[PDB]
């Protein structure tokens, strides 16, 4: 095959060209996003029951739905939280590889069927079913600076004007509003309602009567009286359109002739759907747009289009409206592309310099300069063939493979140059010989390298998907590179390369290069002599070798494992959590402080702080909060003291001085999902109808008994909220009936006034918005206010709630969890310093067994995935080993010889482990993918030394030692070059600061150390390896 294309460089050129064309094409039609889809498919059902308590929600809504979630395919688990704000979410999480569309429709088809089983006011609100994706492309903030707009005013504007266009914009898949559109608000006054003998109920009846859509019919409708000349539509009462109208709604005609209007017993205004959440942006009112990339789209294009669309909107904004951009993955992703085109260009340059240095030839300088892009090009195509996206992971998968791509070019060319310079052959007859010397090993190398990477594609769940990105990118790059080196370069050499006449090692040459040529030709002898001496005394090194293997082993263990390394992402959060019973006022007092810190004590680094009151990662509620802090460009924040992780602990410290709050800050994780390695996710489960009190108790016990092992379990905590005082009001049925007061009148009056009530819809300026009846706040704050509400009894007499109710304080839950159907309590924690998670888990498991009867437990989330999908790392790598051996055995026609090559592996690992452990880094994914490529190259380098050596023996009839010296001599140069080019190649990443740094550091610093050692050690240890194995057998 290389001899085929040696006589046919046109064909090769065609193949080359075809590869580039597909590649260039595929570079265009290929999607761009930060990370690909990693988390397995999840679907969330969400509803809201206006004015409901956590139990009411759970018991009328959550249970009924959970109870109907059957017959759905590929479920793994189902979790739900029902809280004090009226909202339930239910999250069904499916197997990896489930079609999310299918999973979503199945879930919704079941919800549909369960719908008539839910309360009126809930089917009325509806229950939305969506895919779970915690990946925003960006977040558009919309604020008002001249204070003429409440956050409601802004939200409505955003909805009415901006939202739909952003929706329609190219590449945007979903758009979410950080507020609600307007709502017609009727703010009842119980004092007025009493002087006119009116309950909330009449107010609701009136509204449904006068804000309605009445069908009429037609004039001249079919069947007609013939001779009818006209057919028209009869158009009757339609929906109300204004506050003026709603206020003119008629409630009562007093006997004296007076009129009672809705505005006579209410204040009426355009308001919000709900008032649970207060959004502020640097202290000013705020709303927003949470925007998500669409499938197969391009983050960059889409982001650009989103901005260009907002631009077109600017001319029409009211006063003091402004767009700002507090979250944008796009400048980030830009940085990642730039840095990887750079690295792929830098490396061609490094290879050019090296190629020219040693080989001193321009016509040869070109061969790798063509081959490498051609391979990188066609790689893109095959990536598109399986439809991957240009993303953080596949891009780094390229830089990691760049070493092997470079190598195959360097190798093939250099060996032709050597064959001439040693035998005085013509370029054509030389390459035929040179290719003949390495071709089989190359096929062999491609197999051996396959068996190193391909297994990694087979890991399961979230992590597996990540490895799979690297695994596939690197196997294709490799295989093209081998194909290219068997088809293109052979031809390119044979037809591009300047002749060399026998013996001419350029020792008799000019200045730098003559000196280099002699300093190198000499150092080749020192090396030769060194190996000869090393071979005279092999025992010394089998001992040395066993020490590196121990060092490797010891180093490995004492290296912390992580998933993906933290990153100054331009933003970070901070959580606030006031205690039970705290008003939203008070929460804003804290939040304004937190905002104050970041704007004062970090004027330098903080551009904005988006404060959200009422929402929190543990729950919803008037006593919770979160602040999104946006930083100035990395170019304006230099030096570790100004990066996220610094500002974090500094802000966490200052906030520990906050009197009655729980306030800290934290950085987001890389990929928004997988949480913590060493970290676990635990579900305590009520398997026998024990109830809340008993479950809180079993929880308490499990927590307390976990706190008594700080050597395994650390930071073991409840995920949910704690019970809080509730106001229990008891209706006296007897006295209600006896006074002539209805239960339903009583209850509707209570709930409408105190909780609100969705009456119907109306039309505001062409858009359909909701109508809400509730008490004006000053009549629904305190318990004394309850008896200020009057309900009309059948006899027409006005009766105060004080006369048929009783009230007491009692504790209940403001958030109630469930897991696979049963009540539950979620428990978080991590493995203590230096322990594994399966250890910390095993203890939790052990500790849980001693819990009260009826209490069970399950592992969810990352812990679920671990408990089923980490065990493969040995088994998969055992397959590797076996195939690797098998291939090598096929290659060398020897059950024995393969050991000589396989032994090379730790020589690569030890430097990497040294280099990581040095810097203070981790055994994370990039590190591990870097290990494999380090190991790959060294395995390759070895494969060639062995093959040449063996070749000399079998063919030229040389001795063992004679061939190992000669081989190792021949193979010295191309190993120095490749390394030289690669170590430099990765250097930029090694030292990088900020802006996608943490990642580059990980891939780089573990490739560098590993390459250092695998080069130094292998040029001495591999010759030893061959000899001892050939001796033993």
């Amino acid at each position: 095959m290389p001899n085929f294309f040696i006589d046919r460089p046109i064909f090769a050129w065609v193949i080359a060209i075809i590869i580039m064309l597909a590649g260039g094409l595929a570079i265009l039609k290929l999607p761009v996003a930060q990370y690909p889809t990693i988390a397995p498919p999840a679907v969330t059902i969400s509803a809201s029951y206006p004015g409901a308590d956590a139990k009411t929600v759970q018991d009328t809504v959550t249970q009924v739905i959970e109870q109907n979630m059957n017959g759905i395919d590929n479920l793994m688990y189902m979790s739900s939280n029902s809280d004090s704000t009226g909202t339930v979410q239910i999250t069904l999480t499916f197997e990896s590889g489930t079609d999310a569309d299918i999973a979503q429709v199945q879930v919704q088809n079941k919800l549909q069927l369960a719908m008539p089983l839910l309360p009126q006011e809930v089917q009325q609100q509806g229950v939305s079913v969506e895919k779970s994706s915690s990946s925003f492309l960006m977040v558009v903030g919309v604020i008002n600076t001249d204070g003429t707009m409440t956050q409601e005013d802004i939200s409505d504007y955003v909805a009415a004007n901006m939202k739909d266009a952003i929706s329609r914009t190219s590449g945007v898949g979903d758009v979410q509003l950080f507020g609600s559109q307007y709502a017609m608000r009727i703010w009842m006054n119980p004092n007025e309602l009493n002087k006119f003998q009116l309950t909330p109920v009449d107010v609701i009846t009136a509204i449904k009567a006068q804000n309605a859509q009445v069908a009429a019919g037609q004039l001249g409708g079919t069947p007609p009286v013939k001779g009818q000349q006209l057919n028209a539509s009869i158009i009757a009462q339609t929906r109300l359109t204004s506050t003026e109208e709603f206020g003119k709604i008629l409630l009562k005609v007093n006997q004296d002739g007076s009129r009672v209007l809705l505005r006579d017993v209410a204040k009426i205004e355009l308001g919000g759907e709900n008032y649970d959440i207060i959004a502020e942006f640097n202290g000013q009112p705020a709303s927003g747009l949470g925007i998500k990339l669409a499938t197969g789209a391009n983050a960059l294009d889409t982001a650009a289009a989103i901005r260009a669309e907002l631009a077109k909107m600017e001319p029409f904004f009211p006063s003091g409206l402004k767009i700002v951009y507090p979250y944008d993955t796009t400048p980030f992703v830009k940085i990642s592309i730039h840095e990887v085109v750079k690295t792929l260009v830098e490396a061609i340059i490094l290879v050019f310099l090296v190629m020219y240095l040693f080989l001193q030839n321009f016509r040869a300088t070109l061969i790798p300069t063509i081959a490498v892009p051609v391979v990188l090009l066609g790689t893109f195509a095959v990536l598109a063939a399986f439809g991957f996206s240009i993303n953080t992971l596949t891009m780094f998968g390229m830089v990691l493979a760049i070493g092997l791509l470079v190598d195959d070019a360097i190798v093939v060319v250099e060996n032709v140059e050597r064959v001439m310079a040693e035998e005085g052959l013509p370029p054509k007859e030389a390459t035929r010989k040179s290719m003949g010397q390495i071709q089989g090993a190359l096929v062999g190398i491609a197999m051996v390298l396959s068996a190193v990477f391909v297994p990694m594609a087979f890991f399961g769940g979230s992590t597996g998907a990540i490895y799979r990105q690297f695994s596939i990118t690197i196997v294709s790059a490799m295989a093209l590179s081998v194909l290219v080196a068997l088809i293109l370069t052979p031809a390119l050499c044979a037809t591009m390369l300047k002749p060399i006449a026998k013996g001419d090692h350029g020792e008799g040459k000019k200045g730098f290069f003559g000196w280099f040529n002699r300093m190198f030709e000499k150092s080749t002898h020192h090396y030769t002599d060194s190996v000869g001496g090393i071979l005279r005394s092999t025992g010394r090194y089998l001992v040395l070798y066993l020490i590196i293997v121990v060092g490797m082993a010891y180093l490995f263990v004492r290296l912390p494992s992580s998933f993906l390394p933290d990153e100054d992402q331009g933003v970070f959060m901070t959580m606030v959590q006031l205690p039970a019973g705290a008003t939203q006022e008070r929460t804003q007092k804290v939040l304004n402080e937190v905002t104050h810190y970041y704007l004062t004590k970090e004027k330098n680094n903080v551009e904005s702080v988006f404060a959200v009151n009422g929402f929190n990662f543990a729950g919803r509620g008037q006593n919770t909060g979160i602040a999104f802090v946006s930083l100035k460009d990395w170019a304006d924040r230099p030096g570790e003291e100004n990066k996220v992780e610094a500002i974090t602990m500094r802000a966490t410290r200052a906030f520990s001085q906050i009197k009655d709050a729980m306030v800290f800050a934290f950085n987001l994780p890389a990929i928004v999902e997988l949480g913590t390695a060493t970290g676990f996710d635990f579900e305590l489960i009520d398997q026998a109808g024990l109830g809340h009190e008993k479950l809180t108790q079993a929880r308490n016990q499990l927590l307390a008994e976990a706190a008594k092992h700080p050597d395994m379990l650390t930071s073991v905590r409840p995920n949910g909220l704690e019970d809080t005082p509730q106001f229990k009001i008891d209706i006296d049925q007897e006295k209600a009936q006896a006074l002539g007061v209805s239960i339903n009148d009583i209850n509707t009056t209570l709930g409408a006034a105190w909780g609100g009530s969705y009456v119907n819809d109306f039309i505001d300026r062409g858009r359909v918005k909701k109508v809400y009846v509730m008490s004006e706040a000053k009549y629904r704050m305190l318990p004394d206010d309850i008896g200020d509400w009057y309900v009309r009894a059948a006899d027409g007499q006005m009766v105060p709630f004080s006369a048929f109710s009783s009230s007491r304080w009692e504790y209940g839950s403001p958030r109630l969890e469930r897991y696979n159907g049963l009540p539950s309590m979620e428990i978080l924690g991590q493995a203590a310093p230096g322990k594994s998670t399966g250890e910390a888990m095993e203890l939790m498991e052990q500790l849980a067994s001693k819990l009260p009867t009826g209490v069970g437990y399950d592992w969810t989330g990352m812990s679920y995935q671990e408990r089923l999908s980490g065990n493969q790392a040995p088994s998969l790598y055992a397959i590797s080993l076996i195939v690797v051996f098998l291939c090598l055995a096929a290659l060398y026609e020897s059950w024995s010889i393969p050991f000589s090559v396989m032994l090379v592996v730790p020589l690569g690992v030890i430097g990497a482990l040294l280099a990581a452990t040095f810097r203070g880094l981790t055994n994370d994914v990039y590190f591990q993918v870097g290990l494999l490529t380090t190991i790959g190259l060294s395995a390759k380098n070895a494969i060639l030394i062995v093959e040449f050596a063996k070749d000399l023996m079998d063919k030229e009839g040389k001795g063992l030692i004679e061939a190992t010296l000669d081989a190792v001599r021949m193979r010295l140069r191309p190993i120095l070059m490749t390394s030289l080019a690669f170590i430099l190649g990765v250097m930029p990443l090694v030292i990088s600061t900020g802006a996608g740094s943490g990642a580059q550091n990980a891939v780089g610093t573990g490739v560098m150390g590993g390459m250092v050692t695998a080069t130094v050690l292998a040029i001495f240890f591999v010759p030893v390896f061959f000899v001892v194995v050939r001796r033993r057998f």
Binding site: G581, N700, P725, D732, S806, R808, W809, Y811
Partner: protein, 156 residues
């Protein structure tokens, strides 16, 4: 209403016996009330923490202290069925005929939830069996409506 006051509130409702002891040594408030007027005595009574109740009562805690809705710790104890806590409170001075804002006595609540042992004890400490809520019901009434035959016998 203080750093330790609130701290004590936390400790009593969760029943961290030791942390209470320390706070007690430190002079933490025994009249620290939350937003609903519950003192650490109420908290310990509602949640059934006998050691704490005994401890707090030694440290001058108010046993007839009362929430914003008129309810003393004895109520919470009687209602939620902690015999031992009821006895202690009573022995330590508790008002057995205390009426919350609805006119509901601790007898009433024990009656409704049918904790008869608590009823006898309250009866033994001289609870007015004839006392009636805002709706005018006796604990006997509560009993016949709930259909507790055994309980109604006692209340005669």
């Amino acid at each position: 209403g203080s750093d330790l006051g609130k701290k004590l509130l936390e400790a009593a409702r969760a029943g961290r016996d030791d942390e209470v002891r320390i706070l007690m040594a430190n002079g933490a408030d025994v009249n620290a009330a939350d937003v609903v007027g519950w003192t650490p005595l109420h908290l310990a009574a509602y949640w059934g923490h006998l050691e704490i109740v005994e401890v707090l009562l030694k440290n001058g805690a108010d046993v007839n202290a009362y929430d914003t809705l008129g309810s003393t710790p004895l109520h919470l104890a009687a209602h939620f069925g902690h015999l031992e806590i009821v006895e202690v409170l009573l022995k330590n001075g508790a008002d057995v005929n205390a009426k919350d804002d609805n006119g509901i006595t601790p007898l009433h609540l024990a009656a409704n939830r049918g904790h008869l042992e608590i009823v006898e004890v309250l009866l033994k400490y001289g609870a007015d069996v004839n006392a009636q809520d805002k709706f005018g019901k006796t604990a006997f009434d509560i009993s016949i409506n709930n259909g507790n035959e055994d309980l109604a016998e006692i209340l005669q």
